[PDB]
Each structure stands twice: as structure tokens, then as C-alpha cells.
Amino acid sequence: PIVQNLQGQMVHQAISPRTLNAWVKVVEEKAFSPEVIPMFSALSEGATPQDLNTMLNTVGGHQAAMQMLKETINEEAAEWDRLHPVHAGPIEPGQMREPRGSDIAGTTSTLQEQIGWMTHNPPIPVGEIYKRWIILGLNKIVRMYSPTSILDIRQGPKEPFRDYVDRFYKTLRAEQASQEVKNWMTETLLVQNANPDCKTILKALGPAATLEEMMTACQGVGGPGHKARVL
Amino acid sequence: PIVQNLQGQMVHQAISPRTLNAWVKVVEEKAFSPEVIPMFSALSEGATPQDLNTMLNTVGGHQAAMQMLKETINEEAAEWDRLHPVHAGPIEPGQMREPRGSDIAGTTSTLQEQIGWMTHNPPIPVGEIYKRWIILGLNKIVRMYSPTSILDIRQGPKEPFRDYVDRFYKTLRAEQASQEVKNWMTETLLVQNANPDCKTILKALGPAATLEEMMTACQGVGGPGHKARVL
Amino acid sequence: PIVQNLQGQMVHQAISPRTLNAWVKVVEEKAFSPEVIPMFSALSEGATPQDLNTMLNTVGGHQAAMQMLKETINEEAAEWDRLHPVHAGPIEPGQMREPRGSDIAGTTSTLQEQIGWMTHNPPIPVGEIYKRWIILGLNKIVRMYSPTSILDIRQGPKEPFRDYVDRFYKTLRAEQASQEVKNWMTETLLVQNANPDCKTILKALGPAATLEEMMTACQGVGGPGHKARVL
Amino acid sequence: PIVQNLQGQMVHQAISPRTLNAWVKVVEEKAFSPEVIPMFSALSEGATPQDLNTMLNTVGGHQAAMQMLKETINEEAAEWDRLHPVHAGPIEPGQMREPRGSDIAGTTSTLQEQIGWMTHNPPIPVGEIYKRWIILGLNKIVRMYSPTSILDIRQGPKEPFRDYVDRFYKTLRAEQASQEVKNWMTETLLVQNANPDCKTILKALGPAATLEEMMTACQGVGGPGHKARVL
Amino acid sequence: PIVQNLQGQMVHQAISPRTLNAWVKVVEEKAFSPEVIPMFSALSEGATPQDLNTMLNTVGGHQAAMQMLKETINEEAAEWDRLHPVHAGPIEPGQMREPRGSDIAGTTSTLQEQIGWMTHNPPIPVGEIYKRWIILGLNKIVRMYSPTSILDIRQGPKEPFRDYVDRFYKTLRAEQASQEVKNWMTETLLVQNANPDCKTILKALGPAATLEEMMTACQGVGGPGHKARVL
Amino acid sequence: QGPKEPFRDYVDRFYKTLRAEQASQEVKNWMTETLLVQNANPDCKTILKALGPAATLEEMMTACQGVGGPGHKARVL
């Protein structure tokens, strides 16, 4: 990344082995889950194109997924130059030029230019432009083996309600939809078939008390709910 | 390393034994493989010849790989040397000697010289030249440490297409083939070495199918393969 | 050690406790071996003759071999006076005093003198001369050892032509072998026990070829699922 | 501990956890090997009398040995007090009062009076004088802890001599014998207690035969490369 | 925490998560013990009341002995109020307000106010005073919970004299008895509670024998005299 | 040769093969140390403990008398 410095000018640093290891733990295991997009955000806060390609490349796992991302963003890269002047500004390495799509994604730019673009004030946001293409590329792999349907979000009869929530957000962030279809279906079927003790205390409290008493309810559910609560 | 390479005054920093112990750990976990090479690059952004000689000599094991790499960087230096004339040194303070191919590899040069050439503005880049040479020798081990080969890889008779096409892509990463060859390879060769059950669906899927549309063929058939995976 | 060596603005700081914990168990557990040598070089950046002398006193394993290492160091430290006698150049330029063999081995020099030598620009480089002498004695000490079971690494008749070859260089890496002895051990161990088809290919190549060539052979010779790929 | 300063007088910094960790490991693993003296002193660089005291309160086992060591310090602080008479009447205004034995022990004296003594002219080594009390006490604990006498160290008939030499030099570390006596032990107990065949060679080589020559005794016995083979 | 040395302005440093973690992890291994204390001193270097509070507040285990410890802090806070007149404003014109029991415990005062008394001439060590109250707290904890004591303990059937002396001293640290009592226990009761055969030979080392003379004697009688050791 | 073997055809095979190569003199000495000595019979290696590195050839060719074999086929006709 680019990292602010105490006494002077901003410094470029290479992405650390801890950071590529922390990322490797995430992506190879969360690949088909919507969960990866904000981890990606957080572990790419200062990131240059070169940092971004380094983060793509150091993954071992899901190599054909990894290509479907690389191919996806080169289409964005081609797309960009359709409306935006090609080779505008200075021809030569080491000057302030206006980046093409394949400059954005660090394919045709050298790192020195990237450093110039990201040290400018306000910064020239090449890596932010590229991260949005990688999020869109990430949406496509997340979709590929994920479920999508509103009737396919599962709800067991004795669960203490939380497991349904924890499935809900990792289902409906795969594909965009209507807020009203997400709300109305919550009400007519999903919550209406949930744990009948849970519904009782919760919808007696209503939209007028905090979820605490509902969440303090439904103790002792199988083996895992019998597990210690005071430790 | 020499740090702060593309930003004003660059300066030297020592390679840490934990950075070295962590390098060797990738090598323990992935053997000699493609996926090593970017971890090598990430830890090689600022590297002097001496950092590079410190990186190969700390490996210890895999000594047939080390010996092959070692002749390839020597064969590369020899070639620099018979192509670019190098004569007798400075006779006065404030003067700089020419690199040899041996100097660039850190055979005959001392670190202080390496610092002078690579901290000059603009630098005389001995670390670049050699790190590339080392990468050539790393790729060349990949050929002689390859699991299977692109023609030999194939789909088991009840094997999911999804498992197959990932390991196929792992396989094509070790392959050094051109891009037009890589294009055919990921289309025809892939479909051909498919099993008879998926091959049909794959022939029906036909010309001009994208990787998005590859990865979604043979879904939802059930049976063996599906234990942890939602249909 | 000095902190900020080669970086100006230098301070002397005390030796780190995790560097000492890593040191004592490395010399204890693994012995005077080829891996010690490049780690000792990486481990001991910025160290003074007090720090390196503090580090030879803290080594608690291999005592007898250490007394031949101490004799060896006391020999170079003596010989340096025989090789480079103090101030036999011009008295006029410069103003430090020229160090004896035993101001380098930290035996007569005070820590202020060593600080001044290593805080000059360019410096008088006491630490690194000391680190060479210890490396040189690490090589003499290594040669005091020879692995049993060099000659028991015999090529497995149906196995690929890799790990036995690998092991044979590894066992013989500090054994100092001759061209004809290396070719003879190659035939004896490797060629004469390998696979029938391979043995014909290897006798046809001859045991005197470089490693990229020996590695190339025997791969894709065999028929359907018999092509001898690395396991 | 004590830390260096580039303008004006020295300053003190917080004690490190990992220093106490390094010290507790080298105390614990072998329960007080002669490894404690170079190691304690490696971690007692710049260590005030209150830091040396913190190092003594780190040892949680061995509370006999630890109080024996405190009563040893108690006799040493006395030794100091007897050697030097206590100032009668008022101390002269200005610079530090001379240190009394328990003040050196860090019990009756504060941190800042230690800073005072070390910045003073001449320097008063309050850290270094108390540190010698500890190390004498640590050798008392190692002497108590030692398994056998250097005059009873001896080996079975087919054990290597070279392994005995090493057992000898491990043995020597805790032994404060005069050097003539130690040279005499080197050339008598090793030479006398070597196996019949090493007696045959050490006679042939003679009285002036080296320690390297001692370790290379019983060499040449086997077949090539430590293996006999029939033609 | 606070550091004053080599800073240009006197403000707070934020507490490390690995500080708190390392403190909790110390309590895991040892419990409230003598053992936590030297690791508490290092992990509470520069500690202000607020930091001290945070370090108390994350302990989740041992919660009766937390209640005894806090009670004991409150108690020396009550003591201090009736100790000397606390000045509610400045003690003299040009000097800070005095700290009473709620100011030392961190309840009425704010972090910069606490930085004030540590950075002030003269300094008032509010956080060390509270650490002492913490040290007194812990000293009551180990004594209520102490499983046996000095006039009930005796040397075992097969217990070495040394490990008896060690096990007495460990008891006698936890036992918070009056000092002339403890001085009678280390002189007379220690001798009296040994093995009886043992006790007769400590009768035989002449009047008032020293701990080193005692430690170097008592041989053959009671528990094991020989100890196997790793060199 | 095997380790207990009487230390005569091996010495013919060594010298004849040396005479075949026509090896350089210095290399013959390194070959002797490398090969001849490290293959020698036990009693022949007692001479290299008794004499150390300064070992003469006549001593070694006068060793190994307690085993059989043909010797040098010395006779008086």
C-alpha cells in the first residue's frame, strides 16, 4: 500500500506476508459466500493496482474462479476506454498521464506511475476504480455455486431464531432484489413458521421492546443449546 | 532490501531471519509450485543481489531444485558477460565501475557496491536483472516438479466437472504455453478430456461458451460428490 | 548492535531476547551444519564485536567442536596481524587508529572504539570481518563431519528419478566431491538401479550432463498412465 | 534497563516481558546448566540493580537455590560494607554518596540513585558490581546442581572417543581450575581413557598431538564412505 | 500508559491489546500466585490508573478473589482519607491538587489529570501507589487460600532436603506472618521440621549454620541424593 | 574388495589399472589414500594406527599374515 509517515512525505510499502496469509485464510474458504466483499475492503484500504494483483495472485485455491475474475475485469478495462480518451497526457513512464482501463488494473502501468497517481492531492483513484471491478468479479464467483431463492432460506422448528438470521444475510446479498419482496416474504412465511415459543415471547414484546428477552428465551435446544452459558 | 525504491532517497534495510524463516514455510507448504513465485515476488520488491543470495542459500533442502536454478542463473550471467564489455575500475574517488553478470548475481560484488548502483538516481538495476534470472530458474524447476501435465490431466467417470476444471486450471498454471495456445487448451482440451456423462452436456454447450457457462455445466445431477454442497 | 547501520543517525541498542532464544536452540538442536551459515549472516545484522562475543559465549551445545572453532578464530585473529599490520599506509589522511586482529575479534577493543569505527561514514567494518572469520570456521567445522548413509541412497526401481537424486546432492553438499567421483556416484547409486527404459535413456545421456538435461529425461516415455511424473 | 541518548545524558526504558521469558526458559529447560551465566548476562545488558532484582523474582521454582543466592548476596553486601567504612557525620554537599553494600543489592537503593551513580564522574558501576554477586550465586546453584566430578567422567568400550571429548568440554564449563591444570586434564584424562585403538594412533601421533587430531582418531577404519562392498 | 523519556510533549500512549491479552493469558497459566507478579511488573510498566483498571476489568476468572482484592483496594483508599489532610485545591500556589482515594483509584480523575501527577515536580506516583494496593491485594489472596503452613509441614518420606527447603520458602512467601516470626521460622523451625536423621546432622554443622553450608550438607539421609541432568 | 579379504588381487587390480591409465603421479597418491587405504584389510589398517600418516608401504605388505589365501605365491625352487 501507501502509508502516511510521521516526519514527511508518504511511503509505498510492500503488502506483508501476514496480510497475504490473513487474506488467504479468508478468500479460499469464503469464495462462494457474500462475506468476502467487506474482508476484501478492509484488507485493501491503501491498496495500489500492484497490491490488488498481488492479492489476486497469492491465493492458491480456486484457480478457475480466479481466472473468471481476471477475464471479468479485463472486460471492464476494455469498456472504460470506450468513453474515455486513450493515451491522453504524456506518452513516457514517470509523468502524470490519464490512465486507461488496463493502466487502472496495473497491466500496462508501472508502479512508479501508480505511486504518482496515488500520491496526488486529491488522490487519482486508480486502485479504488480497480477494487470496484474486483467486487463485481467477486459477486460473480459468490453467485456461481450459491443458492439465491427467498424460499430456500432454511428455518428449523426448535432453533432459537438466530441461525435463521445468520443464513438470511448470506443468502440475499448474492443477488440484488426488491426491499418489499425481502420484507413481505419475511412476514408471510419465514418468521411465521419459526420456533413457536420464540414467536410467542417475541411478538408479544412486539416492535416496542428490545430483542433481549426474546434472545434470553429458547434455552436448552439440543446438545449445543445445552452447552454452558455462564463460563 | 533497499526501501523506498520509487520515492526520493532510497536506503538499505536488513532482511530479518523471520522473513527468511517465513519464506522457507511457503516452500515447505506448497513445495516447488507456481504459487510460490508470487510469494517470492512480494518478498522481493526491494531486493539486492545479497538479499537474493541470502534467500536461496537459507532453503537448505530441495537441493536438486537448487542446483538446477543455480546453473540457470550462471548461464544467464555468462551470457551478459560475453555481450557487454567490462574493463578495469575507477582510478579516482566519485566514479562507478561497470556491472558484470557475476556482479549482478552477487558472486563477485560486495553489498556496498550493490547499494551504490541501486541508490543512484536513476539506478543501475542489478537486482532486477538477477531476480528475473532467479524466476526463470524457479519456472524451470516447476516443469521438472510438475504433478501430471496438461495433456495427461482428465475427468474421472463420476467426477464433478466443477472439481475437474479447477485442477485443470491449477495444471495450466504450471504449463508455460502461449495465450492463443492457453485459449484452445481451456476450450477443446478441457471438453475432450471430460468424462462421457458431462462431455455430452459440454458438446451441447458448444462453441463460444464462457467460463461462467463452463462452471455451471453438470450441476444438480446429485449422487456421489455432494456431501457438503447444496443442490 | 548498531541500529540504523548504513542509514545514518546511528545509535547503539542492546541485543534482542528473541534473537538470543532463536540462537541458543538453533546451535543446540541442529548442530554446526550448512543451514547455520546463511541464517547466522541474516541473524547478526548491525552487531558489534561485544554482541558477537556475547553470542559465542551463549552457545551451550557442541562444546568440543566449539573449541576447534575458538582455535580457528584465535588463528585468523592472530594471522590478521601477520597479513595486515596496523597503519602501514599514509599517516596523513584519516584520523582513527588502524585495528589489530584482536581489536577486530573484540579482545583488545573497547565498545566506544567499535562504535566509532562502525559510526564513521564510510565505516571501518569490524563486525563483518568478524562474521567472515566465524563463517570460515563454520565451514572448517562442517568438514570435521561427514553424513553416514550417503552411499545407501539408491534409486527405487519403479519410482521416479527425483527424490533419491535430491537426497544424494543434499548428503554430498559439504562433502567436496570431484567431477569423476560425482559421475561415478551418479552411475553407482542412481543409474544402475533406475527403471529398464530409463536406465537405457540415462546410459545414452551419460552421467556427466548438467541437471536440467538429467531432469528432462524419462518423462513422457511410458505409455498410458505410466509416464513417470513426479509423485 | 538503560538506553542510549544522542544528546545529553543516558535515559531509562521499561523492562521487556520477553527478557524474563528468555531468562525463565534458560533457567527451566535443563534446571541450571552453565548456560545461565552467558545468557543472564546477554539479557542483563544495561540492567539496573532493580532490573537484576526483577530477574531474580522471575524464578518461581527452586526456592532453596533462590534464597541460598539471596543469603549469598547478603554475605556479599556485608563483604562490601566491611571492605569500605561507613561515612561518619554529614555527607559532603554535591555529587552522590559512595554506595553501601545493600544499596548495591538494590534493596535499600532506588532506581534514580543508580542513574546518578552511572552518570557520575568517575562512573560508579552499580549494575555491574551487583551482577557479579548474582553470577557467583548462580555458579553456587550450578555447583550444587552438577551430577559428577571431572575426575569421574568416563565412557564404555565401543562409544566414540570424540563423543567423550565433547562430554569432557561440556564438563569443563562449570570448573574454575587453573589453565595449566586444565591443559594437564586435556592431555591426561582424554589421552589415558581413550579406547585401545585410539591409544595406538595417539602414541604414533605423540605427546604434542592436537585436539583436531584427538577427534580424528579411529578414522580410516571402515570401507569407502563408511561402507565395505564386495566386487 | 505513560512514557516521559525522549518525548517532546507529555501525553498518553494507548494500551496494547496484546498487553491485556498477555496479562489474561498469565492468569490462565498460573492463577493468583507469586508467579504472576514479575510478569505483572513488566506488563504494568508506565501504567496509569485507567490502564490498571482496564487490566483488572478484563479478568473474568477467580472472582471471589477479585472481590477480596477490590475490597482491599477500597480499604487502603479509606485509610488514605484519614491518613493526611488531602488539599481539595492546589497544595500550594504553583502545585497540583492532592489525590485522595477516589483519585488514586481512577474514579474522580481523568487520564490527562493522571498524566499531570506523574509529570509534575515533585511527582506523585498515583499509579505506583495503586499498584502497591494491588500487590497487597494479591498478598492477602494467596494467604487465605494457602493449603497448609509452617508448623504443620514436615519433610516427606522420599523428599530431598533441598526440595523440602524450596517447598518451606514457597509456603513462607504465601504466608504473610510477622517478620521476627518468619526469621524464627527460617532459623529454628526449618531445622526442627526436617527428617529426624537429617535433623541430627544439621545439629552437627556447628552453631547458627549458613544456608550455603546447610545446602552443601545433609547427604545420604532422607530423599534422593543423586540427580540425573542434561548438560 | 570385501573388508576381510586377504589384500592381494585388489593390489594387482589397483596397480595394473593405474599402469593402464598411465595416471599422473600426484593423482596416484590421492587415489591411494582414497581407494587403496580405505579398502585395506583390518591388520593392514593397524599399520596406519601404529605408524599414523607417515606409513611406509613395506609394513602394509608385511601385514595380514594370520588369514589365508595365496599371498604373493613365494617359493624356493
d(Cα C20, Cα D40) in Å, to the nearest integer? Answer: 11
Three-state SS for chain E is CCCCCCCCCCCCCCCCHHHHHHHHHHHHHHCCCCCHHHHHHHHCCCCCHHHHHHHHHCCCCCHHHHHHHHHHHHHHHHHHHCCCCCCCCECCCCCCECCCHHHHCCCCCCHHHHHHHHCCCCCCCHHHHHHHHHHHHHHHHHHHCCCCCCCCCCCCCCCCHHHHHHHHHHHHHHCCCCHHHHHHHHHHHHHHCCCHHHHHHHHCCCCCCCHHHHHCCCCCCCCCCCCCCCC
User: Residue C17's closest chain D neighbor by CA?
Assistant: D19
Residue D80 phi/psi, 5° resolution?
-55, -55
Asked whether the beta carbons of residue E215 and residue D68 sit closer than 8 angstroms, the reply is: yes
Tell me which amino acid residue F54 is.
A
Contact C138, C56 (CB under 8 A): no
DSSP state of D229: -
Q: Tell me: cis bond preceding E157? Omega within 30 of 0 counts.
A: no
Contact E154, E193 (CB under 8 A): yes
Question: D108 vs chain C: nearest CA distance in angstroms?
Answer: 27
Tell me which amino acid residue A97 is.
R
Q: Largest Cα–Cα distance of chain C, in whole Å?
A: 80
d(Cα E164, Cα E153) in Å, to the nearest integer? Answer: 9
Buried/exposed A142-153: b ≥16 CB within 10 Å, e otherwise: bbbbbbeebeeb
- Touching chains D and E? (3+ Cβ pairs < 8 A): yes
Tell me which amino acid residue A50 is.
Q
Tell me which amino acid residue A204 is.
A
- Touching chains C and B? (3+ Cβ pairs < 8 A): yes
Rg (CA), chain D: 25
d(Cα B137, Cα B134) in Å, to the nearest integer? Answer: 5
How buried is residue A120: exposed, middle or buried, by Cβ count under 10 Å (0-12/13-18/19+)? Answer: exposed
Please work out, in degrees rounded to the nearest 5, the angle formed at the alpha carbon of residue D7 by the alpha carbons of D5 and D8. 85
Contact A129, A104 (CB under 8 A): yes
Task: Give contacts of E55 with chain D, Cβ < 8 Å.
Answer: none
D216 touches chain E (CB under 8 A): no
Residue B9 phi/psi, 5° resolution?
-65, 110
DSSP state of A186: I
Residue C121, beta-bridge partner list: none
User: Residue B36's closest chain A neighbor by CA?
Assistant: A58
| Number of Cβ within a 10 Å radius of residue D9 | 8
Asked whether the beta carbons of residue F37 and residue D201 sit closer than 8 angstroms, the reply is: no
Report the length, in residues, of chain D.
231
d(Cα C111, Cα A108) in Å, to the nearest integer? Answer: 53
User: CB within 8 A of B155, min separation 6: which ones?
Assistant: B161, B164, B193, B194, B195, B198
Asked whether the beta carbons of residue E229 and residue D31 sit closer than 8 angstroms, the reply is: yes
Cell digits for B36? 510460490
Residue F72 phi/psi, 5° resolution?
-105, 5
| Number of Cβ within a 10 Å radius of residue A168 | 17
Contact D145, E162 (CB under 8 A): no
Question: B9 vs chain A: nearest CA distance in angstroms?
Answer: 11
d(Cα C183, Cα A171) in Å, to the nearest integer? Answer: 64
C7 touches chain B (CB under 8 A): yes
The residues in B 100-139 lying below 8 A from C, measured between CB atoms, are: 115
Cell digits for C66? 566449539
User: CB within 8 A of D56, min separation 6: which ones?
Assistant: D66, D69, D70, D134
Residue C5 phi/psi, 5° resolution?
-60, 125
d(Cα C110, Cα C114) in Å, to the nearest integer? Answer: 6
User: CB within 8 A of D137, min separation 6: which ones?
Assistant: D68, D69, D72, D73
d(Cα F45, Cα D222) in Å, to the nearest integer? Answer: 9
Residue of A230, B123, D102, D62 lying closest to E35 (CA atoms): D62
Residue of C20, A17, C29, A59 lying closest to B22 (CA atoms): A17
Torsion angle, CA of C30/C32/C38/C39, rounded to 10 degrees? 40
User: Residue D33's closest chain C neighbor by CA?
Assistant: C60
For an interface test with C, give the residue of B24, B144, B171 to mutate (most C CBs within 10 A). Answer: B144
If you write DSSP's letter for every residue of F32-67 in order, what string do you get?
A: IIIIITTT--HHHHHHHHHSGGG--HHHHTT---SS
Cell digits for D6? 544522542
For CA atoms B170, B171, B174, B175, give the dihedral sign.
negative
Cell digits for A175? 443477488
Buried/exposed B122-159: b ≥16 CB within 10 Å, e otherwise: ebbebbebbbebbbebbebbbebbbebebeebbbeeeb
H-helix or E-strand containing A200? Answer: helix A196-205
If you write DSSP's letter for every residue of B7-25 in order, what string do you get?
A: SSS-EE-PPPHHHHHHHHH
d(Cα B171, Cα B151) in Å, to the nearest integer? Answer: 10
Asked whether the beta carbons of residue E38 and residue D58 sit closer than 8 angstroms, the reply is: yes
Asked whether the beta carbons of residue C227 and residue B149 sit closer than 8 angstroms, the reply is: yes
N- to C-terminal Cα separation, chain B: 51
d(Cα E56, Cα E72) in Å, to the nearest integer? Answer: 14
Task: Report how far apart, in Å, the C-alpha atoms of A81 and of each of A85, A112, A116, D116 are.
Answer: 7, 22, 21, 71
Cell digits for A13? 510499502
Q: Count how many Cα atoms sit within 13 Å of the Cα of residue F8 in the half-sphere of its side chain.
A: 13
Show the DSSP H helices in chain D as ranges: 17-28, 36-42, 49-57, 63-83, 101-104, 111-119, 126-145, 161-172, 179-193, 196-205, 211-215
Asked whether the beta carbons of residue D166 and residue C14 sit closer than 8 angstroms, the reply is: no
User: Residue D210's closest chain C neighbor by CA?
Assistant: C68
Angle of helix E126-144 versus helix E63-81 axis, rounded to 10: 130
Nearest to C6 among B12, B20, B57 (CB): B12
Asked whether the beta carbons of residue A14 and residue B38 sit closer than 8 angstroms, the reply is: no
User: CB within 8 A of C152, min separation 6: which ones?
Assistant: D227
Contact C68, C75 (CB under 8 A): no
d(Cα C154, Cα C186) in Å, to the nearest integer? Answer: 10
d(Cα D99, Cα E194) in Å, to the nearest integer? Answer: 39
User: Residue E44's closest chain D neighbor by CA?
Assistant: D14
Residue of C68, C83, C61, C209 lying closest to C134 (CA atoms): C68
H-helix or E-strand containing A29? Answer: helix A17-30
A60 touches chain B (CB under 8 A): yes
Residue A12 phi/psi, 5° resolution?
-80, 135
User: Residue D218's closest chain F neighbor by CA?
Assistant: F49
d(Cα D231, Cα F2) in Å, to the nearest integer? Answer: 7
Task: Give contacts of D224 with chain F, Cβ < 8 Å.
Answer: 35, 38-39
Contact D50, D75 (CB under 8 A): no
User: CB within 8 A of A5, min separation 6: which ones?
Assistant: A11
Task: Report how far apart, in Å, the C-alpha atoms of D204 and of each of D191, D217, F53 are.
Answer: 13, 11, 9
Give the strand pairing for D2-3 and B11-12: unpaired
d(Cα C171, Cα C34) in Å, to the nearest integer? Answer: 11
Q: Tell me: cis bond preceding C122? Omega within 30 of 0 counts.
A: yes
DSSP state of D12: E
**Chains touching D (3+ CB pairs < 8 Å):** C, E, F
Cell digits for A96? 502524470
Cell digits for D199? 591409544
